[PDB]
Amino acid sequence: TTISAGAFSQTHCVTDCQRNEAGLQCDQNGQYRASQKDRGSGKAFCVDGEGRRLPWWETEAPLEDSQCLMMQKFEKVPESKVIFDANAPVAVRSKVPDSEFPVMQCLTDCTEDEACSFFTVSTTEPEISCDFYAWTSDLRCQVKVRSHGQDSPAVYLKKGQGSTTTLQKRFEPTGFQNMLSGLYNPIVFSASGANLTDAHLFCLLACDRDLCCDGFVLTQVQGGAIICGLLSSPSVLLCNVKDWMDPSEAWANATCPGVTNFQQVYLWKDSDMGSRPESMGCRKDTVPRPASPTEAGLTTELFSPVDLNQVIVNGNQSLSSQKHWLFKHLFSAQQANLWCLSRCVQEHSFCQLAEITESASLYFTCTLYPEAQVCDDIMESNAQGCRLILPQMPKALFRKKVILEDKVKNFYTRLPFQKLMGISIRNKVPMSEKSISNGFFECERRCDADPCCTGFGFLNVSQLKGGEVTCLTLNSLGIQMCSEENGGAWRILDCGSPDIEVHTYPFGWYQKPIAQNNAPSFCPLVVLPSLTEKVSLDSWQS
Amino acid sequence: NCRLLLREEATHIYRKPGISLLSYEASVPSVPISTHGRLLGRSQAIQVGTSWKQVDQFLGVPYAAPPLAERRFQAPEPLNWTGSWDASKPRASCWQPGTRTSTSPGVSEDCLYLNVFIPQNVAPNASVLVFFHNTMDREESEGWPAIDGSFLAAVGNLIVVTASYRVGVFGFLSSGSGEVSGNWGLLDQVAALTWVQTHIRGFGGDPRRVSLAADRGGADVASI
Amino acid sequence: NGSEVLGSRQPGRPVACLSFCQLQKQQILLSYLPQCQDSGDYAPVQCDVQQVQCWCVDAEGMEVYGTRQLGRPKRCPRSCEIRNRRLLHGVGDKSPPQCSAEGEFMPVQCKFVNTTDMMIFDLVHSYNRFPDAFVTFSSFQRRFPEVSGYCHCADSQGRELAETGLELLLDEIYDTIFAGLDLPSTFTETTLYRILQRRFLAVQSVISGRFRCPTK
Numbered sequence A: 001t002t003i004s005a006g007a008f009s010q011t012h013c014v015t016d017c018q019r020n021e022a023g024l025q026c027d028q029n030g031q032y033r034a035s036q037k038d039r040g041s042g043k044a045f046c047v048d049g050e051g052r053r054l055p056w057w058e059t060e061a062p063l064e065d066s067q068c069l070m071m072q073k074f075e076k077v078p079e080s081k082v083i084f085d086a087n088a089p090v091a092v093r094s095k096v097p098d099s100e101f102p103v104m105q106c107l108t109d110c111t112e113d114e115a116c117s118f119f120t121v122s123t124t125e126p127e128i129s130c131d132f133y134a135w136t137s138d139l140r141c142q143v144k145v146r147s148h149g150q151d152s153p154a155v156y157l158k159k160g161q162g163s164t165t166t167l168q169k170r171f172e173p174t175g176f177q178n179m180l181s182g183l184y185n186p187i188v189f190s191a192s193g194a195n196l197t198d199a200h201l202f203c204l205l206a207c208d209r210d211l212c213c214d215g216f217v218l219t220q221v222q223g224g225a226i227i228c229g230l231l232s233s234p235s236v237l238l239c240n241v242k243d244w245m246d247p248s249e250a251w252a253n254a255t256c257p258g259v260t261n262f263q264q265v266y267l268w269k270d271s272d273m274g275s276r277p278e279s280m281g282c283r284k285d286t287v288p289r290p291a292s293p294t295e296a297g298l299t300t301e302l303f304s305p306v307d308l309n310q311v312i313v314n315g316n317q318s319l320s321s322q323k324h325w326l327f328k329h330l331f332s333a334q335q336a337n338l339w340c341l342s343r344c345v346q347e348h349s350f351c352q353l354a355e356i357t358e359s360a361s362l363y364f365t366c367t368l369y370p371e372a373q374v375c376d377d378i379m380e381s382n383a384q385g386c387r388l389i390l391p392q393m394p395k396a397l398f399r400k401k402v403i404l405e406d407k408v409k410n411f412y413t414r415l416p417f418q419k420l421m422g423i424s425i426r427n428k429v430p431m432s433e434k435s436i437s438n439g440f441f442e443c444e445r446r447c448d449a450d451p452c453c454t455g456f457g458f459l460n461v462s463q464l465k466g467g468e469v470t471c472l473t474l475n476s477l478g479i480q481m482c483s484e485e486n487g488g489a490w491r492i493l494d495c496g497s498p499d500i501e502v503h504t505y506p507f508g509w510y511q512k513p514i515a516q517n518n519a520p521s522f523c524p525l526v527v528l529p530s531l532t533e534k535v536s537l538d539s540w541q542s
Numbered sequence B: 001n002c003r004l005l006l007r008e009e010a011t012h013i014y015r016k017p018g019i020s021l022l023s024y025e026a027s028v029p030s031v032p033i034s035t036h037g038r039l040l041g042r043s044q045a046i047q048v049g050t051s052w053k054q055v056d057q058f059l060g061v062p063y064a065a066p067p068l069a070e071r072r073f074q075a076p077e078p079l080n081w082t083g084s085w086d087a088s089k090p091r092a093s094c095w096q097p098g099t100r101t102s103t104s105p106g107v108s109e110d111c112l113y114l115n116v117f118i119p120q121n122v123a124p125n126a127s128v129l130v131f132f133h134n135t136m137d138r139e140e141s142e143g144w145p146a147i148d149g150s151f152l153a154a155v156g157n158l159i160v161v162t163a164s165y166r167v168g169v170f171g172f173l174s175s176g177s178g179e180v181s182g183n184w185g186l187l188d189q190v191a192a193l194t195w196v197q198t199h200i201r202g203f204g205g206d207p208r209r210v211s212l213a214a215d216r217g218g219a220d221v222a223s224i
Numbered sequence C: 001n002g003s004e005v006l007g008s009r010q011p012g013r014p015v016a017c018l019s020f021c022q023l024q025k026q027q028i029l030l031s032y033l034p035q036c037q038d039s040g041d042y043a044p045v046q047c048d049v050q051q052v053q054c055w056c057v058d059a060e061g062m063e064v065y066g067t068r069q070l071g072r073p074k075r076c077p078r079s080c081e082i083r084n085r086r087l088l089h090g091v092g093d094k095s096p097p098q099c100s101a102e103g104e105f106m107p108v109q110c111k112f113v114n115t116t117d118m119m120i121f122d123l124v125h126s127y128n129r130f131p132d133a134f135v136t137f138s139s140f141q142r143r144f145p146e147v148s149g150y151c152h153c154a155d156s157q158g159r160e161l162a163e164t165g166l167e168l169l170l171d172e173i174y175d176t177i178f179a180g181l182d183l184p185s186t187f188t189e190t191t192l193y194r195i196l197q198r199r200f201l202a203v204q205s206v207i208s209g210r211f212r213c214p215t216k
């Protein structure tokens, strides 16, 4: 949304903060910064991320310091939404302040999750007691207890906090967007009714009152409707928020939402799923428990086991885009493998690897991966150096079997070059046993199999000891040097090593014909050109 | 005006700036000669059409020992100098036979001297022209005696060297079977050619592109 | 199909009529639209009426298999590259036909292999050239005797001309020069192919009055 209609460049189209500012500054990413100076010169007030408006009620009154580097997700409840001296006036604890930002001291005291829920300050005496309360008993839900009668400072409300302790269960913000099965009472609220926090309090207290609720789901649709359901005995949670599951393609039947935004599922982390007896309570224990899979039903010979010694953990650095699907262990035990391999079969692309482990036996993790082979540029047809890179050590990993179709899909063209700098090899298949006219066809099939295959090198990898025919799968072609255009006259670019032998007709680097759209998504880390060993400053006449 | 020659059209064009191997210091060019020392020179601004080029010229560089009264009628020994030769004024040319003998330093013995003209930013391996010419008795007060090859240097982007050589009885006298054998001027030309073969790479030139030149009877003694 | 008629046969030659482009187009109108040029020849890029899929044809209609992709293609392969790639996919003749700088067949070609193991067929030349580096005819007969170069000239599609030019050349006579160069990566780029082509054209010089294979 440019100001004018001209819009000469992309630098001239302007962010939402940087569009309109009246004493407002914007970060390097273009939105509002956290802190903003008040009336020009003055104090600092720290505003909302998407709207310029301040959360006033937090710290509109203290003419005090800057740097609100603690997220005020709290909300000072208006006095019309609190009663006084109700018949349970117990505060879990308080602390004497140091008379130096007492409110910020108590807000830092409830950075940790446990049983906090709201504050009550006490300004009658110079000591300012932050008597805070708990997630327990005490649309349109107010604060239902307070201790002191005569005077009335405000009370707060921590909103949307991740972890929670509500005196019977231990709630956690499980990042999985959607749920498969098991739900008593999905109830809707009016679009003008709640503000996604009153609903949070309502469903949390509803589960905390009831028994054996493993968790609860809530969501707000962009049409204003707010839906709250209360989970118990889920089969498997699927489609986490931080996965590559969207293919930038039209949704098929229903994949993640199942209702077509905001959506979350919370689980009691210390649940008694298996330990719960069936007969007592009878609280919808009748999850269907489908029939056992016979051996002839699916062969599962499309997968091969991989010894974990070749796997290397690089969790702090790796960005292999991938998906978690989390089982619940109530009924799936050792048949999570067969189910997740069948789901790997169901997702036709983007399941070159399947991984199965368990965290604490309430979860049962299966993660879907693309091919995470990282090959060194040593260029040898042994392929033993190609070692996987994964975030965490698996317990049971499986590789999908590669399939080669009858005919090629692309008319691959021979590059006129003989030497590459930035080489990102994916596979190093040795094809010495076969002949040339069929080995090259198999290598073309191999590159047609992989989605991110942009080229293939078909060459004699070691010429010191005879020769070894090989097929290298090239994720990214690099600096292509040593052409035949100059015809051997004045070559200042050094040509290839004499043991490579990429010259003669069947052999010699082929490029997949250039897909005009893009290379597809989820491909490994965005390919970098070979880094310049010097810094090339601009002392060149342009 | 000079434009760039390119094989194909392009949208970004970068060129590293030209460099000169001539260390300027207070606007007199200087060159280190490897075995001997330093050369101090001269700088000139030259107009062709309405455009101007700076050429560094080194008039008076020697290449052999002077033949005065003992080395007459003998092969040229090398001149083994050390320090900083002042190459800022022309020296004398050799004794041509037809000479009016006007009182002047234009003609005399001790005439084995070069004249090296180098444009400002030459090609990195520039060609070398070697012109052999003994000038007639002309007043060298207007510097460059009768051949300022600097214009050919500036227009053609190349290094010009104009030399002098013994001619006449001093150049060619033969008597007896040995040691007054002759061809002394030819040996002087060979000595100048070996000098420009050896030391020209510090000037910016390329010693594999040397082109010999002479004229008007000197070409008779150059095609040998 | 050649068995049809426009429906109105006139005496003498017709003034002009629609080509196979326009016949197929009128058939489809009376989907996908076959785009044609001004002349009667399918354009080397054929796209659907919605610009989502484009491929390459060879002026007769059938689609080159690899060229199907989203959007517009660049460097559309021509008939020589298609045939030469097909010979690496199992088509019978294992000797690659001689090809120009672009994807076009040389006017003069050489199957180059006869009487392989005393029986007359074509040796597997695309496999043959690689492991044994031959640059010299004497060394070639030392490595492979009884193989004589069978050269001819070809059509526009590369069909061999009937009963004409099917010549055989003996490798024994020539003594080799220029044996100090690197391998040129393709037999068509080897100087032996120019030796065969110059010998073949010199033989056909006295024939036909012309120092070439005849044109269209």
Ligand SMILES: *[C@@H]1O[C@H](CO)[C@@H](O[C@@H]2O[C@H](CO)[C@@H](O[C@@H]3O[C@H](CO)[C@@H](O)[C@H](O)[C@@H]3O)[C@H](O)[C@H]2NC(C)=O)[C@H](O)[C@H]1NC(C)=O
Binding pocket: A432, A460, A466, A467, A468, A469, A501, C130, C131, C132, C133
């Ligand atoms: C690139 O690598 C391939 C790997 O197969 C090389 O092929 C091999 O090449 C050698 C040397 O020409 C062949 O040895 C030959 O064996 C025959 C058997 O009778 C013998 O008579 C010869 O004297 C020679 O020793 C070998 O058979 C062949 N292997 C195959 C075809 O499987 C190829 O040569 C390498 N490229 C280059 C240009 O050398």
Ligand SMILES: *[C@@H]1O[C@H](CO)[C@@H](O[C@@H]2O[C@H](CO)[C@@H](O)[C@H](O)[C@H]2NC(C)=O)[C@H](O)[C@H]1NC(C)=O
Binding pocket: A140, A192, A193, A194, A195, A198
């Ligand atoms: C949801 O949020 C809105 C806006 O934050 C709340 O609206 C407030 O309503 C009271 C009622 O008189 C006003 O005095 C306040 O000024 C309003 N707030 C603002 C920021 O203008 C609303 O009460 C919230 N709760 C619901 C709908 O249950």
Ligand SMILES: *[C@@H]1O[C@H](CO)[C@@H](O)[C@H](O)[C@H]1NC(C)=O
Binding pocket: A252, A253
């Ligand atoms: C889902 O919908 C698609 C149409 O978009 C259809 O092809 C398919 O048969 C449906 N069912 C399944 C199980 O994919």
Ligand SMILES: *[C@@H]1O[C@H](CO)[C@@H](O)[C@H](O)[C@H]1NC(C)=O
Binding pocket: B065, B077, B078, B079, B080
């Ligand atoms: C100059 O000195 C060098 C030093 O080796 C010597 O070879 C040469 O003969 C000397 N020349 C004269 C004329 O003394």
Ligand SMILES: *[C@@H]1O[C@H](CO)[C@@H](O)[C@H](O)[C@H]1NC(C)=O
Binding pocket: C001
């Ligand atoms: C022309 O020939 C093709 C291939 O044989 C055939 O598919 C098509 O139907 C024919 N056209 C007719 C019969 O009009």
